[PDB]
């Protein structure tokens, strides 16, 4: 039944981020710049304030009930999006989407770590989970775009709700969301784990790579309109190479980094993240961003697939075998990088500028890259 758990996480993370990326191409057309920016950040902020309360929560109720709650909140958010047509209602739906995604991500990654106890196999299970995440990000944009250009606004949200119902049936079949079972092992407190430089280094690498992508997310279209003066239909396709490379890289490197070397995988991934971010503000046309964006996506996939099991290896080597808090910290890094991007990108660009922002991010990644060597062989307990 171990494989069956991965199937849910493949589909749980598939649909959780499908609404996260299907709402972007329907909101600015529907409501028709700062006001729209704060809307997207609602998922990031609200999940950040709930992650510390979710980590220890999984130590007493298990990963099943939080996942079922995330499913329920997914259903409610998508159905509310299907009907609500005001700024406040969309903000509430976004906040619900963020909180439910918090449960879904944390519980899914924790249960994936728990049910897989071999580092080599767990480096491929998480790789395929991140591949499903990349597939969801790939399919979110064209889905909503096409069925808003044709079927109607409530159509894609209704279809996603039906797929969520299928997900609930699947979780009733295999995940068993019926009873609360506390974890036998007592996880270490979060503020012990924040004092461990190894977990700090891993979380920092993840947070800095995802900050490199997150800052690029909203800031890139503004730079495109300012410099290249390009139509709208290909702006979403601009990030398509990055997401495709992320999917390919997460699968391949979940296969490969176990034999390549985890520390080396993270180091080279951060180095290519830095180099790609340096080269990104140098492109003079849409074709010029295929290379740097593809490299950045592959690098972020490398960092994710190499540090996602590295957290489990660290917690198994030093701390106890309770997995909620470490992935709570990792998702906190993810979500903080997500939050810092859109709410502050305009101010950062107006103050220093996009090229200097990318240079700063890339230099931080490069200078931080050697610190990943600290995880080559962390001492045991």
Ligand X SMILES: NC[C@H](O)c1ccc(O)c(O)c1
Site membership for its own copies, residue 373 (CB under 8 A): yes
DSSP 198-211: HHHHHHHHHHHHHH
316 burial level (CB within 10 Å; 0-12, 13-18, 19+):
middle
By the rule CB under 6 A, 239 interacts with ligand YHR: yes
CB of residue 292 to ligand YHR, shortest distance in Å: 13
Q: Which of 86, 80, 87, 99 is nearest to 16 (CA)?
A: 99
User: Of 101, 210, 306, 343, which one interacts with ligand X (CB under 6 A)?
Assistant: 210
Q: Rounded to whole angstroms, what are the CA distances from 190 to 187, 193, 291, 345?
A: 9, 5, 39, 30
CB atoms near residue 348 (< 10 Å): 17
Q: In degrees to the nearest 10, what's the CA dihedral of 54, 343, 74, 117?
A: -50
Out of 10, 40, 103, 246, the residue judged to bind ligand X by CB under 6 A: 246
Q: How far is the CB of 233 from its own copies (least distance, A)?
A: 30
Choose between 65 and 294: whose C-beta lies nearer to ligand YHR.
Answer: 294
Q: Is 9 in the site for ligand X (CB under 6 A)?
A: no
Per-residue contact string for residues 234-273; x = within reach of its own copies by CB under 8 A: ------------------------------x--xx--x--
From the list ligand YHR, its own copies, ligand X, none, pick the one residue 370 interacts with, judged by a Cβ distance below 5 to 8 Å according to partner type. its own copies
125 binds, among ligand YHR, its own copies, ligand X, none (CB under 5 to 8 A by kind): none
Contacts of 183 (CB under 8 A, 6+ apart): 58, 59, 60, 62, 322, 324
Residue placing its CB nearer to ligand X in the complex, 100 or 140: 140
Q: Residues 14, 135: contact at Cβ < 8 Å?
A: yes
From ligand X, ligand YHR, its own copies, none, which one binds at residue 322 (CB under 5 to 8 Å depending on kind)?
none
Quote the DSSP letter at residue 189.
Answer: P
Torsion sign, CA atoms 191, 192, 193, 197? positive
Contact between 213 and ligand X per CB under 6 A: yes
In the list ligand YHR, ligand X, its own copies, none, the entry touching 8 (Cβ below 5 to 8 angstroms by class) is: none
Single out the residue of 102, 243, 361, 365 in contact with ligand YHR (rule: CB under 6 A). 243
Structural tokens at position 14: 């598939």
98 with 42: CB under 8 angstroms?
A: yes
For binding to ligand X (CB under 6 A), which residues are involved? 133, 137, 210, 213, 217, 239, 242-243, 246, 297, 300
Binding stretches for its own copies (CB under 8 A)? 264, 267-268, 271, 274-275, 278-279, 359, 362-363, 366-367, 369-370, 373
């Amino acid at each position: 039944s171990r494989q069956l758990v991965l199937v849910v996480v493949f589909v749980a993370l598939l649909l959780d981020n499908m609404l996260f990326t299907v709402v972007v191409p329907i909101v600015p057309t529907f409501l028709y710049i700062t006001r729209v920016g704060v809307l997207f950040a609602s998922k990031a902020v609200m999940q950040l304030l709930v992650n510390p309360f979710v980590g220890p929560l999984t130590n007493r109720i298990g990963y099943h009930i939080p996942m079922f709650a995330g499913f329920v909140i997914m259903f409610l958010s998508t159905v509310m999006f299907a009907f609500s047509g005001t700024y406040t209602l969309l903000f509430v739906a976004r906040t619900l989407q963020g909180i439910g995604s918090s449960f879904s991500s944390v519980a899914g990654l924790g249960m994936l770590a728990s049910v897989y106890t071999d580092d080599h196999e767990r480096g491929r299970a998480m790789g395929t989970a991140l591949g499903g995440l990349a597939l969801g990000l790939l399919v979110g944009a064209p889905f909503g775009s096409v069925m808003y250009e044709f079927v109607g606004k409530s159509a894609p949200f209704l279809i996603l709700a039906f797929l969520a119902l299928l997900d609930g049936a699947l979780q009733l079949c295999i995940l068993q969301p019926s009873k609360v079972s506390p974890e036998s092992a007592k996880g270490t407190p979060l503020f012990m784990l924040l004092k461990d430089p190894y977990i700090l280094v891993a979380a920092g690498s993840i947070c800095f790579a995802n900050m490199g992508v997150a800052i690029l997310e909203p800031t890139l279209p503004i730079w495109m309109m300012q410099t290249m003066c390009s139509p709208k239909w290909q702006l979403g396709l601009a990030f398509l190479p990055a997401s495709v490379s992320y999917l390919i890289g997460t699968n391949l490197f979940g296969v490969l980094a176990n034999k390549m070397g985890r520390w080396l995988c993270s180091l080279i991934g951060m180095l290519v993240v830095g180099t790609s971010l340096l080269c990104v503000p140098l492109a003079h046309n849409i074709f010029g961003l295929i290379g740097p964006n593809a490299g950045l996506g592959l690098a972020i996939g490398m960092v994710d697939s190499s540090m996602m099991p590295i957290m489990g290896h660290l917690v198994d080597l030093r701390h106890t075998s309770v997995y909620g808090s470490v992935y709570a910290i990792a998702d906190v890094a993810f979500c903080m990088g997500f939050a810092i991007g859109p709410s502050t990108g305009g101010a950062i660009v107006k103050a220093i500028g996009f090229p200097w922002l990318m240079v700063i991010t890339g230099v931080i990644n490069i200078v931080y890259a050697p610190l990943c060597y600290y995880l080559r062989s962390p001492p045991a307990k």
